[PDB]
Tab-separated table of C-alpha atoms and ligand atoms in Angstrom:
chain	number	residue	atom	x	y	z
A	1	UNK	CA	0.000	0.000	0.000
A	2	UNK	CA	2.639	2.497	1.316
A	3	UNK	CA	5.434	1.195	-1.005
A	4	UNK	CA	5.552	3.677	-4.224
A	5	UNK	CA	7.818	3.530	-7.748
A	6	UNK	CA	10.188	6.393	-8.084
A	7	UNK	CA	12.265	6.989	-10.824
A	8	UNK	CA	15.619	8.851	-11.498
A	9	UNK	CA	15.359	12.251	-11.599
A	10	UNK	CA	15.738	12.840	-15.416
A	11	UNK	CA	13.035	10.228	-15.688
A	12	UNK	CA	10.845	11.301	-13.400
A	13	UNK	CA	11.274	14.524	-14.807
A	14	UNK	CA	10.831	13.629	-18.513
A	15	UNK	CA	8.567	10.789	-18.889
A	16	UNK	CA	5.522	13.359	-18.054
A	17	UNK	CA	6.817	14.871	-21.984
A	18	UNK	CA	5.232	13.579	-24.692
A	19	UNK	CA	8.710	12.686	-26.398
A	20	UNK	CA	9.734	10.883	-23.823
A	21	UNK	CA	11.981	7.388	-25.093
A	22	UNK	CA	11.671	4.551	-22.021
A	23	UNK	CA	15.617	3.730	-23.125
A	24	UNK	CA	17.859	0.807	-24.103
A	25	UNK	CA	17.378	-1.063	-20.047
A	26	UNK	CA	15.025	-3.379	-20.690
A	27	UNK	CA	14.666	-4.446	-17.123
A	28	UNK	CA	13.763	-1.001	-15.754
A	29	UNK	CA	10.327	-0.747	-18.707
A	30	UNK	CA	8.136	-2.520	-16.069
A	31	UNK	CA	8.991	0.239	-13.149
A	32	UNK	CA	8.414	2.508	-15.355
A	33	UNK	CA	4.585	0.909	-16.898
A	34	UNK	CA	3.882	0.364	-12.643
A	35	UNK	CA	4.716	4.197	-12.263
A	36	UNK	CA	2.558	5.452	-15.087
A	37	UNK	CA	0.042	3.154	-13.930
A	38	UNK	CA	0.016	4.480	-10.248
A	39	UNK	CA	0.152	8.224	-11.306
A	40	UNK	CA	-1.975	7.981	-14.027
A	41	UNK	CA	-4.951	5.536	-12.168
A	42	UNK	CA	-3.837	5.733	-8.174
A	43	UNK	CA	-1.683	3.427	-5.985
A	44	UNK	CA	-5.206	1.333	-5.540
A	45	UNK	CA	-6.191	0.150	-8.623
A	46	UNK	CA	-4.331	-2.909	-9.260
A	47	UNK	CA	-2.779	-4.897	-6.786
A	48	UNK	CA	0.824	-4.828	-7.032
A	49	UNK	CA	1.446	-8.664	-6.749
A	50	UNK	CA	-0.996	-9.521	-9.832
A	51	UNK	CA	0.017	-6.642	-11.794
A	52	UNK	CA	3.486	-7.646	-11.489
A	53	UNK	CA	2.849	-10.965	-12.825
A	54	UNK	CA	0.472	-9.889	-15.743
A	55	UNK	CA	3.662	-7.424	-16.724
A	56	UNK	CA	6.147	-10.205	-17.069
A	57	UNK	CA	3.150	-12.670	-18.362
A	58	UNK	CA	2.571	-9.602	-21.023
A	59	UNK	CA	5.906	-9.274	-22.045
A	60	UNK	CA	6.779	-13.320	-22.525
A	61	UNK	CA	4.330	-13.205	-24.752
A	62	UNK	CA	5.986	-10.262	-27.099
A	63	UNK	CA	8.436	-11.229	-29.442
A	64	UNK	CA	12.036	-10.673	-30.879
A	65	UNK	CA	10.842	-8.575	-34.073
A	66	UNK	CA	12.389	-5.365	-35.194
A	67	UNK	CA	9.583	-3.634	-34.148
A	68	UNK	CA	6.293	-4.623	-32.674
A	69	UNK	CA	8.092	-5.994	-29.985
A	70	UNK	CA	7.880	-5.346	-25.713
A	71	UNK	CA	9.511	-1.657	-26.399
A	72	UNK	CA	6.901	-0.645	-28.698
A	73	UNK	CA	3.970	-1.913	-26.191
A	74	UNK	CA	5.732	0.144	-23.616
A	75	UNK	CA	6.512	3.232	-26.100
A	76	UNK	CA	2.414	2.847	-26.843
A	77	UNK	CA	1.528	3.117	-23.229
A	78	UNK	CA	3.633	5.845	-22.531
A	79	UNK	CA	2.302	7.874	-24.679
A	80	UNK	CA	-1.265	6.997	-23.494
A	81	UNK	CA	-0.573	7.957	-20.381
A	82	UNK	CA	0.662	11.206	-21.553
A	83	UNK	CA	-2.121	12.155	-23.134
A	84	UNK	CA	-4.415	10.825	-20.174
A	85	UNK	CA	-2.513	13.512	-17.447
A	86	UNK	CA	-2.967	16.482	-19.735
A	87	UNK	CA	-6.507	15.573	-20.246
A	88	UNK	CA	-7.282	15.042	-16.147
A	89	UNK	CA	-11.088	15.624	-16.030
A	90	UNK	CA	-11.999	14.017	-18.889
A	91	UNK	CA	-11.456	10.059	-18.826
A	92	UNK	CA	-13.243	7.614	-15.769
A	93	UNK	CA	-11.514	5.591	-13.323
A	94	UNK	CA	-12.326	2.375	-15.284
A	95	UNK	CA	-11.435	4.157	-18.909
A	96	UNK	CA	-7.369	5.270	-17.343
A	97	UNK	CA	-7.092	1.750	-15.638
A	98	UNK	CA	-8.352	0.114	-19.254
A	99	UNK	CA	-6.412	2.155	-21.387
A	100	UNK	CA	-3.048	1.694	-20.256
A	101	UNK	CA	-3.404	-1.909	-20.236
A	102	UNK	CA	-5.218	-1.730	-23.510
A	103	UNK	CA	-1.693	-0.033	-25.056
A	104	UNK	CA	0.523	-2.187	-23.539
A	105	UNK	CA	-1.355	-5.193	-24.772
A	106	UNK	CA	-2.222	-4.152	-28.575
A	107	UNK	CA	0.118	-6.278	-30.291
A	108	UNK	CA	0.413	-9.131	-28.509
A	109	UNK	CA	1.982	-12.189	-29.849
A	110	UNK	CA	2.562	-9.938	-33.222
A	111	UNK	CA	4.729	-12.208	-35.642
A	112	UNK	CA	5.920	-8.903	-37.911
A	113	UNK	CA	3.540	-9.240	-40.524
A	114	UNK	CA	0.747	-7.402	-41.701
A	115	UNK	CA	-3.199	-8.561	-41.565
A	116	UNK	CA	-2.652	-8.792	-45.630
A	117	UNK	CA	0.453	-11.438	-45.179
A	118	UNK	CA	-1.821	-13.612	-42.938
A	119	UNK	CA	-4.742	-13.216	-45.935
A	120	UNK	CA	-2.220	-14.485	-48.554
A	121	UNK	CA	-0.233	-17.186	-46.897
A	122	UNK	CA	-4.051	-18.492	-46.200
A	123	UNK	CA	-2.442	-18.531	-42.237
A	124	UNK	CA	-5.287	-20.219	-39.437
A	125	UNK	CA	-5.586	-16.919	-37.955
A	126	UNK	CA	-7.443	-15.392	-41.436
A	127	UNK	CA	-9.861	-17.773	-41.336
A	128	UNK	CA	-10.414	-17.654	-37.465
A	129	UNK	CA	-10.776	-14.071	-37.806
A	130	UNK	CA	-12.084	-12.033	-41.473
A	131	UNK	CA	-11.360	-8.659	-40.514
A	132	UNK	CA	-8.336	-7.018	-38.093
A	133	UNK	CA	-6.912	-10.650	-38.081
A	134	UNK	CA	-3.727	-9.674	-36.005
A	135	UNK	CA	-5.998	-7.417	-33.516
A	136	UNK	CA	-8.638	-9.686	-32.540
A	137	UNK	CA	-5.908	-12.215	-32.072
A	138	UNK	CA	-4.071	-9.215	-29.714
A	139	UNK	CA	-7.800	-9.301	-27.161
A	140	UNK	CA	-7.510	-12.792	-27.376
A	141	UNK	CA	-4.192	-13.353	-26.312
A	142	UNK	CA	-5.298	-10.506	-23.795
A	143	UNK	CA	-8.377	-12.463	-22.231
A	144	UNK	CA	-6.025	-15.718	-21.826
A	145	UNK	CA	-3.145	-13.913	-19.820
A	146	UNK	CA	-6.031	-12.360	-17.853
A	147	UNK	CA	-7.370	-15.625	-17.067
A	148	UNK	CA	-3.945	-17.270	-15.739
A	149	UNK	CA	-4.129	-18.351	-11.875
A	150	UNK	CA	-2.845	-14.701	-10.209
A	151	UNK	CA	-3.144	-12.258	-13.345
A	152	UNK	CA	-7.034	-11.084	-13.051
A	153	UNK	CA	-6.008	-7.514	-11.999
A	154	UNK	CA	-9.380	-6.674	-12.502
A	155	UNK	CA	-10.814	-8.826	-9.334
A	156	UNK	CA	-12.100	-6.640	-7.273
A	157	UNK	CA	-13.749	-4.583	-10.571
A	158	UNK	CA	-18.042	-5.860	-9.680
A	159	UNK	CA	-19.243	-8.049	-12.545
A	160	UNK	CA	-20.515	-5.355	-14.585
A	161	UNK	CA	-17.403	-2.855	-14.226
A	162	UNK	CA	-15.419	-6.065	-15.307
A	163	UNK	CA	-17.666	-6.433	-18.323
A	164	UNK	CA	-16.963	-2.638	-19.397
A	165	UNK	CA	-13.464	-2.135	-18.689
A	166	UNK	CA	-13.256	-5.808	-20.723
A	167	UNK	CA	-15.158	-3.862	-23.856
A	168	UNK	CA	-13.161	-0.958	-23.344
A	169	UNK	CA	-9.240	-2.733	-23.977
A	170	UNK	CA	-11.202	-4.679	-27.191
A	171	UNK	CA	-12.860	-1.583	-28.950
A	172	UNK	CA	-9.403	0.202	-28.115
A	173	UNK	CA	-7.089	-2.850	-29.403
A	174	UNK	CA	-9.349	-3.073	-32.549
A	175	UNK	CA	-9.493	0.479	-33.302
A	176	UNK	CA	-5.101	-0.067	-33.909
A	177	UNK	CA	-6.311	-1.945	-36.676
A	178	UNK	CA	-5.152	1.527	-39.197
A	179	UNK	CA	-7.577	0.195	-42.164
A	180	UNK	CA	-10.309	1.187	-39.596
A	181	UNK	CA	-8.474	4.460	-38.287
A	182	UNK	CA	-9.008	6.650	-41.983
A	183	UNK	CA	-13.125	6.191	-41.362
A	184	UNK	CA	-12.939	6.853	-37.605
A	185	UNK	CA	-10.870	9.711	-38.167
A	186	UNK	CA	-12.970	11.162	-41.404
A	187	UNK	CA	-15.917	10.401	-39.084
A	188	UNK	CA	-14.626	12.573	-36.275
A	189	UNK	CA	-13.398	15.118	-38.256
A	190	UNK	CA	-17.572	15.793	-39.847
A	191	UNK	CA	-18.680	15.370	-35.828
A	192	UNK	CA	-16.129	17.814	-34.235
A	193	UNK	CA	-16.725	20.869	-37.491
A	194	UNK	CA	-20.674	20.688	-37.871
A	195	UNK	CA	-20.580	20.687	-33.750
A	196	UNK	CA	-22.110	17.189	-33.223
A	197	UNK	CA	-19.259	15.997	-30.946
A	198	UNK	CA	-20.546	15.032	-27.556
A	199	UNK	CA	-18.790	13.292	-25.228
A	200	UNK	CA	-21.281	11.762	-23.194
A	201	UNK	CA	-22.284	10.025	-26.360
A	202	UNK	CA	-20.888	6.479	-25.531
A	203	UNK	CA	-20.065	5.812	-29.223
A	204	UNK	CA	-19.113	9.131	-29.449
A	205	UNK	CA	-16.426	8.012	-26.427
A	206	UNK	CA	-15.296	4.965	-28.335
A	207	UNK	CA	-14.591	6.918	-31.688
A	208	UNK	CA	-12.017	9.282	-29.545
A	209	UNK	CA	-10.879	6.175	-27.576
A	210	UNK	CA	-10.231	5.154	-30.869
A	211	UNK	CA	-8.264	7.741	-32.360
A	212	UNK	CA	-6.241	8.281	-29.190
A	213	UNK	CA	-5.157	4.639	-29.674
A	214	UNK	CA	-3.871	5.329	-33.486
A	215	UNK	CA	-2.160	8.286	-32.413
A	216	UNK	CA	-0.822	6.243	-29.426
A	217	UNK	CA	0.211	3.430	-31.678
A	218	UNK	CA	1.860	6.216	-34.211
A	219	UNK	CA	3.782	8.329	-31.498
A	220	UNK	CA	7.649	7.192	-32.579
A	221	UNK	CA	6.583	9.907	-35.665
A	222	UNK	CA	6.424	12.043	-32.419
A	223	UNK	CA	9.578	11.559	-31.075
A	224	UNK	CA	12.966	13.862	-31.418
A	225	UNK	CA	14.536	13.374	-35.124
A	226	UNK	CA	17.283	11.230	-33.779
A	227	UNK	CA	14.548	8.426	-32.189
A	228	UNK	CA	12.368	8.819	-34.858
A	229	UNK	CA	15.075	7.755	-37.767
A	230	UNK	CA	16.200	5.081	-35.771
A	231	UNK	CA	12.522	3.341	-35.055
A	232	UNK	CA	11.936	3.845	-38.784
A	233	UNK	CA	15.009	1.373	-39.475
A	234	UNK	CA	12.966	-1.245	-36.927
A	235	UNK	CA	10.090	-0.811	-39.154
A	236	UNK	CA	11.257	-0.913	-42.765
A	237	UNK	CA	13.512	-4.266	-40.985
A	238	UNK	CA	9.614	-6.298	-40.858
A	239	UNK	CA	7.830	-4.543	-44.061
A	240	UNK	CA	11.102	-5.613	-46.558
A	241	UNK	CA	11.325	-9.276	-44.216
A	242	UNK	CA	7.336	-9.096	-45.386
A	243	UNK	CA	8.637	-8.125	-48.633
A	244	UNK	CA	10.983	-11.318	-49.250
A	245	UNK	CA	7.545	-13.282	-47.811
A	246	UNK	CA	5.647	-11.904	-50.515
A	247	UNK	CA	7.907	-13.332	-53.463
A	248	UNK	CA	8.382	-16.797	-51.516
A	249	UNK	CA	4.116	-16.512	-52.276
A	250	UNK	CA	4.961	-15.737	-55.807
A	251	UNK	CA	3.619	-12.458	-55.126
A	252	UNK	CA	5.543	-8.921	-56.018
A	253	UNK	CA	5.501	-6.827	-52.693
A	254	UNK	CA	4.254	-2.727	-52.664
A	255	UNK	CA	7.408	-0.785	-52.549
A	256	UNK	CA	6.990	-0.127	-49.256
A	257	UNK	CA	7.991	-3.854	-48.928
A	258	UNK	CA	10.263	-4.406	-51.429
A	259	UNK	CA	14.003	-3.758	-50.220
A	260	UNK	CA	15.226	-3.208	-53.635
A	261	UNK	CA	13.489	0.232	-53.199
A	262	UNK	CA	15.144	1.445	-49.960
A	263	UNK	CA	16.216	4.769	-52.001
A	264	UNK	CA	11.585	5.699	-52.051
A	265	UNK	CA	11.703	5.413	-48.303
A	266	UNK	CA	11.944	9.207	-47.764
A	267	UNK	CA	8.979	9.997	-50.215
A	268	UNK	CA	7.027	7.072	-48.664
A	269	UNK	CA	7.685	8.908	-45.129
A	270	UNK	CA	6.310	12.154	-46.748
A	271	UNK	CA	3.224	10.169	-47.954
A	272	UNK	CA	2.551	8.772	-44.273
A	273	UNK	CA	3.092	11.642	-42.484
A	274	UNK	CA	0.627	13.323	-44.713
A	275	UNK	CA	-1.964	10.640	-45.366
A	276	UNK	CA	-1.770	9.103	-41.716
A	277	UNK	CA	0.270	10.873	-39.144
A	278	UNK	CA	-0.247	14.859	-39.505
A	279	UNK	CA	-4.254	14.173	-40.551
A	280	UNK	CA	-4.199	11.780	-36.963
A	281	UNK	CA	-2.573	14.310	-35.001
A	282	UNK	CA	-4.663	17.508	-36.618
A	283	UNK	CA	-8.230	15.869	-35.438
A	284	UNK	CA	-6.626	14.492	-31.931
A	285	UNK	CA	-5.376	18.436	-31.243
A	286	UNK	CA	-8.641	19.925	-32.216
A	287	UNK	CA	-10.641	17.145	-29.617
A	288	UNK	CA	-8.040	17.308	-27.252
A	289	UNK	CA	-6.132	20.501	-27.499
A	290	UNK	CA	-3.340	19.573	-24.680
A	291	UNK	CA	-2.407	16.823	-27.360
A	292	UNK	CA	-0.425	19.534	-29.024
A	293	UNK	CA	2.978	18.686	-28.429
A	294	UNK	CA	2.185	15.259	-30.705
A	295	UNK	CA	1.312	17.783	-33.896
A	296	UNK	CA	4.001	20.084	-33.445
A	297	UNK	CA	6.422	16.997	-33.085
A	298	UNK	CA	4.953	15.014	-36.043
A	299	UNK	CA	5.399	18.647	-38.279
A	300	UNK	CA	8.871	18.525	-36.801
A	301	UNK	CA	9.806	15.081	-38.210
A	302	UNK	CA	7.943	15.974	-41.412
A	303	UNK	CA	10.621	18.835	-42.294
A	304	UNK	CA	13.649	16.472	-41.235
A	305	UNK	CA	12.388	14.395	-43.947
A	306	UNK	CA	11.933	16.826	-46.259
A	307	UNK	CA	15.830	17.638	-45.784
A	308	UNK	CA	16.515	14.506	-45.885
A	309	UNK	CA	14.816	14.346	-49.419
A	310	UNK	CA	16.651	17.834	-50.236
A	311	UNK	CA	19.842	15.928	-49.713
A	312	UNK	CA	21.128	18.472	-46.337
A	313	UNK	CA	20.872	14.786	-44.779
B	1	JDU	C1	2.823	3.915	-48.332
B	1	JDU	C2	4.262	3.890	-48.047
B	1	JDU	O1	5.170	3.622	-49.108
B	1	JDU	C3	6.468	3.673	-48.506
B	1	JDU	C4	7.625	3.423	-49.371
B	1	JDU	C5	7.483	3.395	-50.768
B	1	JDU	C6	8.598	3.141	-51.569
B	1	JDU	C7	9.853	2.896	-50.990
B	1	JDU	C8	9.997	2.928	-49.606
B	1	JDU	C9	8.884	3.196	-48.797
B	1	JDU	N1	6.394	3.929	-47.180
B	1	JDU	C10	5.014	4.075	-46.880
B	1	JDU	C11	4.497	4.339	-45.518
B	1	JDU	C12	5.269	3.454	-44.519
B	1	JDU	N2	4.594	3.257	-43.223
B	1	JDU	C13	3.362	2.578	-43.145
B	1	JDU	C14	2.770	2.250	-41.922
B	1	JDU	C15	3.398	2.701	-40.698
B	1	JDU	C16	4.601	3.440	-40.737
B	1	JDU	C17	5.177	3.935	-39.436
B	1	JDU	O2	4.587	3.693	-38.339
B	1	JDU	N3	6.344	4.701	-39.499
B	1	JDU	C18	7.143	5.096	-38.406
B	1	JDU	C19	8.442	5.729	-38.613
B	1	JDU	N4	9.270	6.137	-37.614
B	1	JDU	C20	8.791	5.899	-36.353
B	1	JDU	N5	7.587	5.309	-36.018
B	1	JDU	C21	6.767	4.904	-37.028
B	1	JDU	C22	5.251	3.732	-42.033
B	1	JDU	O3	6.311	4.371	-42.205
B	2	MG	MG1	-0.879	-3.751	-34.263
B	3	ZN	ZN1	1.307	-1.216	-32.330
């Protein structure tokens, strides 16, 4: 009850930022998910024991990809929890407890491959599962972790508060599902200008939810420069691995993919900041205008690519 997380003072200090990067010690990214988790929600909402054992139970069940690996479930979270203490007032005790765990759960047993590479390779999973293959597979793996001896964190949640909280992490791991983020957004965008947003509107709720998770699930756009070249190395690592998938299929790979066309990777970075990132970030500032610091980062990243195309890098 009494016993608290504290971190380093430079930590302490700049995990509250936005840009924040959880660093290269993997053993310290639990202390630092516990102490989101306790500023973010309150020393009482999980019992330290069984969230302890659903952390390490969570990350086992990550992988050794480039990218959508334990770091990037952390990463996610952070960045959730961000955006949850500059928006106090506006999120319930069951939506900040849900959230987090939401985030640090999204991806799950994630292989590196897109919901497209299941489709193709005709993988169990695509049948199991039509639409958001990878993401319903994410809540699943979810539900079974939460339903180990000593990992229901959610005990002393009544039946009903269980039942919400449980509806909650699914709408919010499905919504990272991007093929479903460009109608959410387009969606939110139409409520927010004709004035229809209302937030007491439960599906009204979910759509924001929704786009907070995208954003969430975007953020290493956010980051400084030098963090945000890096991660994009750890991506481009599982789309070209996809890539060389593909053609085992028979099948030639979008450029994205295809690592005989590393040289497009700065105009496919313009593309995504423009069709993805900056639209994400836009909608999320003008629903949530503490969210700032994501758009101005994202624009930030934008112009280093631009150099980069310019040649000054
Ligand atoms: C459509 C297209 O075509 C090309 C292309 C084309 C020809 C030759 C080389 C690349 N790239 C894209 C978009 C690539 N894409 C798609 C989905 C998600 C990300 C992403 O989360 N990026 C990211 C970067 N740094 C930190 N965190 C996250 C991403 O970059
Ligand atoms: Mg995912
Ligand atoms: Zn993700």
């Amino acid at each position: 009850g009494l016993m608290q997380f504290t971190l380093p003072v430079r930590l302490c200090k700049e995990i509250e930022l936005f840009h924040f990067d959880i660093g290269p010690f993997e053993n310290m990214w639990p202390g630092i998910f516990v102490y989101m988790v306790h500023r973010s929600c309150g020393t009482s909402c999980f019992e330290l024991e069984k969230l302890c054992r659903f952390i390490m139970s969570v990350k086992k069940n990550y992988r050794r990809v480039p990218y959508h690996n334990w770091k990037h479930a952390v990463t996610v979270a952070h960045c959730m929890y961000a955006i949850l203490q500059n928006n106090h007032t506006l999120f319930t005790d069951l939506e900040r407890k849900g959230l987090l765990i939401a985030c640090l759960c999204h991806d799950l047993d994630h292989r590196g491959f897109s919901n497209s590479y299941l489709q193709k390779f005709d993988h169990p999973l695509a049948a199991l599962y039509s639409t958001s293959t990878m993401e319903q597979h994410h809540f699943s793996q979810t539900v079974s972790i939460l339903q180990l001896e000593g990992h229901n964190i959610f005990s002393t949640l009544s039946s009903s508060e269980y039942e919400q909280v449980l509806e909650i992490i699914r709408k919010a791991i499905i919504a990272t599902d991007l093929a479903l983020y460009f109608g959410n957004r387009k969606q939110l965008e139409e409520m927010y200008q004709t004035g229809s947003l209302n937030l007491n509107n439960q599906s009204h709720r979910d759509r924001v939810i929704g786009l907070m998770m995208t954003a969430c699930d975007l953020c290493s756009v956010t980051k400084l420069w030098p963090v945000t070249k890096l991660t994009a190395n750890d991506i481009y690592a599982e789309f070209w691995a996809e890539g060389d998938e593909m053609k085992k299929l028979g099948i030639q790979p979008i450029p994205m993919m295809d690592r005989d066309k590393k040289d497009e990777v700065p105009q496919g970075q313009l593309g995504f900041y423009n069709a993805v990132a900056i639209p994400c970030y836009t909608t999320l500032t003008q629903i949530l205008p503490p969210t700032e610091p994501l758009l101005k980062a994202c624009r930030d990243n934008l112009s280093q690519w631009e150099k980069v195309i310019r040649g000054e890098e």
